[PDB]
Amino acid sequence: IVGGYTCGANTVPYQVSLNSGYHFCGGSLINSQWVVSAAHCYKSGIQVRLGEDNINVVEGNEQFISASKSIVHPSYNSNTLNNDIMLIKLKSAASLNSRVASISLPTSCASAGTQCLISGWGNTKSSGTSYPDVLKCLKAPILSDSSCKSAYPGQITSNMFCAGYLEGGKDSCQGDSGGPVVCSGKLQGIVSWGSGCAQKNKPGVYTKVCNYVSWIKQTIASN
Numbered sequence: 001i002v003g004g005y006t007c008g009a010n011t012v013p014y015q016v017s018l019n020s021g022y023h024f025c026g027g028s029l030i031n032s033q034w035v036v037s038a039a040h041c042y043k044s045g046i047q048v049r050l051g052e053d054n055i056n057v058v059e060g061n062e063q064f065i066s067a068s069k070s071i072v073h074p075s076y077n078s079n080t081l082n083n084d085i086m087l088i089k090l091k092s093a094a095s096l097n098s099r100v101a102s103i104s105l106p107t108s109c110a111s112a113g114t115q116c117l118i119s120g121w122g123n124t125k126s127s128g129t130s131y132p133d134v135l136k137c138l139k140a141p142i143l144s145d146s147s148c149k150s151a152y153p154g155q156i157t158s159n160m161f162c163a164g165y166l167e168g169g170k171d172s173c174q175g176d177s178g179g180p181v182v183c184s185g186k187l188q189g190i191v192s193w194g195s196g197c198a199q200k201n202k203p204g205v206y207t208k209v210c211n212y213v214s215w216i217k218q219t220i221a222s223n
């Protein structure tokens with residue numbers, strides 16, 4: 001996250017870190033046994049780390065649970081990043097509390113102008129690299145469809161939305177992928193892609209979770 005603030009330990013209780021020996025992607029806890037993330041984050045051998053603030057220090061609220069199954073969206077396209085979403089089932093159910101909590105799925109798509117919270121442990125520099133060890137937070141509005149398609153001609157599908165600031169300086173960045181965009185207590189987006197980070201007229205692009213709610217429900221009802 002570039003140009004954000006430190007969230008504070010366990011103030012984003014649905015935020016997970018996907019670890020394969022190191023943090024590589026964020027994700028979101030949607031019930032005690034399932035996590036949603038970006039399909040471009042797919043890996044074999046994922047351990048899900050819940051209750052994290054400092055990912056390099058064991059602080060006392062963590063739950064490390066291995067993944068038993070990963071399901072990438074049936075129409076994920078890695079070239080266009082259309083349908084960049086996947087589900088991860090945990091080997092055992094997480095123990096839910098005020099610091100490890102699931103986030104609700106949406107019943108409605110959020111509108112342009114809605115302010116949202118984006119969070120992750122990704123790069124905090126638009127030029128150069130510095131990875132935080134504690135969770136970073138950013139409040140950003142959903143941008144209109146037409147400003148989004150104007151920023152990325154011929155690349156925005158109906159399963160994508162832009163969110164952020166057209167004059168740059170504030171954005172999600174690498175390592176934030178798979179992470180949550182939460183608007184009014186509902187998961188609305190997944191950190192998916194962009195052109196660099198925090199660049200002028202190149203806002204973050206997010207997977208539109210409201211389009212996927214019935215595939216999510218049906219898939220967790222069956223696996």
Ligand SMILES: NCCCCc1ccccc1
Binds near residue numbers: 175196197
């Ligand atoms: N601008 C969008 C921010 C999304 C993440 C990102 C990180 C590194 C390279 C491209 C996009």
Ligand SMILES: [Ca+2]
Binds near residue numbers: 055
């Ligand atoms: Ca920790």
